Amino acid sequence: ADSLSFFSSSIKRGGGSLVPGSGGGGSRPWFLEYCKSECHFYNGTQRVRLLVRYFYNLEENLRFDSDVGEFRAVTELGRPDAENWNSQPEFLEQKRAEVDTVCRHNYEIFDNFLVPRRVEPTVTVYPTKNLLVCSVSDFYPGNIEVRWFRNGKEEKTGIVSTGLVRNGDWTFQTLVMLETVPQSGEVYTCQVEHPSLTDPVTVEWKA
Amino acid sequence: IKEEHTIIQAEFYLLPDKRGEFMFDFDGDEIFHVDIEKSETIWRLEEFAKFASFEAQGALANIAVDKANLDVMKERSNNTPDANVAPEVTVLSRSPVNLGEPNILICFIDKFSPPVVNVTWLRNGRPVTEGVSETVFLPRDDHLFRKFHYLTFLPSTDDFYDCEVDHWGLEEPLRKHWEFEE
Amino acid sequence: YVVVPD
């Protein structure tokens, strides 16, 4: 549908070198020019921050922070690019405008399908070996709360979790496990709250 | 109500591999990447194509400039080469494993650089090139990369699995084992 | 180079 805007690469100028390390080994060296242009939406397009980050091999050397309005060197390796690009006033004007011409432009497109995306979690509870496992899988977005309850009272100790696990295919999963020694008749409840759920999902397990 | 999101355009060019990458990231997940060779937009989920488009030749121009910028950085720094970052490798199922129920094994390669790996799936000790998929090099918050390799499988108690990852930071290609336990 | 449209 609607075409996305993008950050167009800026040309670096050579001529100056720094005194000596980094980058691979002697028998197998490598060289990496790496750039991440980050549009930060703190509350949609109401508050937007642009953070461009330049990496050479393993070292972040240059940044452009829209709250600064100019390029700033993170290490000495990035200072020539900062001095070169900050001497270009039209570049700086164009860069500062990209919170609108790129960031807010692309958000309105992604607001149609990426922002409202919701996948309902699948909740399963099974014992092991003890350890009560609450499996919450195949949900989106990542914002989720998984609580263990024993006799309706929230258990805040003995929790062993994998944390939020990113599957890489726009789904999440997690395992929240409770170390309990269960007395007869005890009711264990795993409660899950998620933006895809109008009401909390509850799965019970009785000892 | 509040909408908190981070959209990242990540790109690199790597020598001596002469390989470039251009991708968009949304809250830690790939939206798309541009096939630099074929100049086409590859959406992470097919349904994304209905809502957005990208002129892929813009990425090819970026990589050409990044290619020339890399030569500038190579002239600027002359540091002793001595650092590769070995990866974290985790093997796990996409869903709870039930016998006879099709599932997906995830080989999660994390916290590594440079962005070059060689990954082999092993079912019962022999490579499997069928029912496998793979992502491009995904960005992290820091300077390192992560990557997903997937293997569709049918859970059984007779089979075992290994994801073998080779990387320049590894003295020896490491394989992470996986087998079904009820 | 890249042959761009138009």
Epitope: S3, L4, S5, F6, S8, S9, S10, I11, R13, Q88, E90, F91, E93, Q94, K95, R96, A97, E98, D100, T101, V102, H105 | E55, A56, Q57, G58, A59, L60, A61, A64, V65, A68 | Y1, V2, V4, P5, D6
Partner: T-cell receptor, first 116, second 109 residues
């Protein structure tokens, strides 16, 4: 202090099938060069752009009918291999300090006319 | 092509008027040119946002509303020529300037 782009010749007349070569000297220090085609209807058609000596983008007509160069020891050049009456236009050369981040400064252009 | 108006403009010496360019998509920035009788494009403005003033000229660019204007005041004979806006498509993979139709300005002596 204004950047200046040089272009020769100012005018050019050629017959159909002849080569029509036009030269451009970008502003000293500008690594990016553009070539546009402006006809009598004030329509501007992008032809090709350079990063130093390397072509980055060009349309199909330029690649198949034109020969473009921006060597380091010589002015930039744009040459039509077999001129056609439809090639009659003002050929503009522009240079810029950066790839897409700064002003494109244009030269006086070459007024090319291709007759039968 | 960018929509530009007016297509022609006759201005008495010492008076003012304004040109405008409408964009159908988000532009990174916009340049304004004055192509004189010699046919050479004279750079007037580079705008990524806001308003700039150059002598008797003045220009504004609004990226969200996708338009740019050029104001001429105290018109002089040397202001004659064909005025063009030109912008970079922020969504365009082709790195090129997209030109407006142009305004043919004549300064009445």
């Amino acid at each position: 202090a204004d950047p200046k782009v040089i272009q020769t010749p100012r005018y050019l007349v050629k017959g159909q099938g002849q080569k029509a070569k036009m030269r451009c000297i970008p502003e000293k220090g500008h690594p990016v060069v553009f070539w546009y085609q402006q006809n009598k209807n004030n329509e501007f058609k992008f032809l090709i752009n350079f990063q130093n000596q390397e072509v980055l983008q060009q349309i199909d007509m330029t690649e198949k009918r034109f020969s473009a160069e921006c060597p380091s020891n010589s002015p930039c050049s744009l040459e039509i291999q077999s001129s056609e009456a439809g090639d009659s236009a003002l050929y503009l050369c522009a240079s810029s300090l950066n790839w897409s981040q700064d002003t494109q400064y244009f030269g006086p252009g070459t007024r090319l006319l291709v007759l039968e | 092509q960018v929509e530009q108006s007016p297509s022609a403009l006759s201005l008495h010496e010492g008076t003012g008027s304004a040109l405008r360019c409408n964009f159908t998509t988000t532009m990174r920035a916009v340049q304004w040119f004055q192509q004189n009788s010699r046919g050479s494009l004279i750079n007037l403005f580079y705008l990524a946002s806001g308003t700039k003033e150059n002598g008797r000229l003045k220009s504004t660019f609004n990226s969200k509303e996708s338009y740019s204007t050029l104001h001429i005041r105290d018109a002089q004979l040397e202001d004659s020529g064909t005025y063009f806006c030109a912008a970079l498509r922020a969504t365009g993979g082709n790195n090129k300037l997209t030109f407006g139709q142009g305004t043919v300005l004549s300064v009445i002596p």
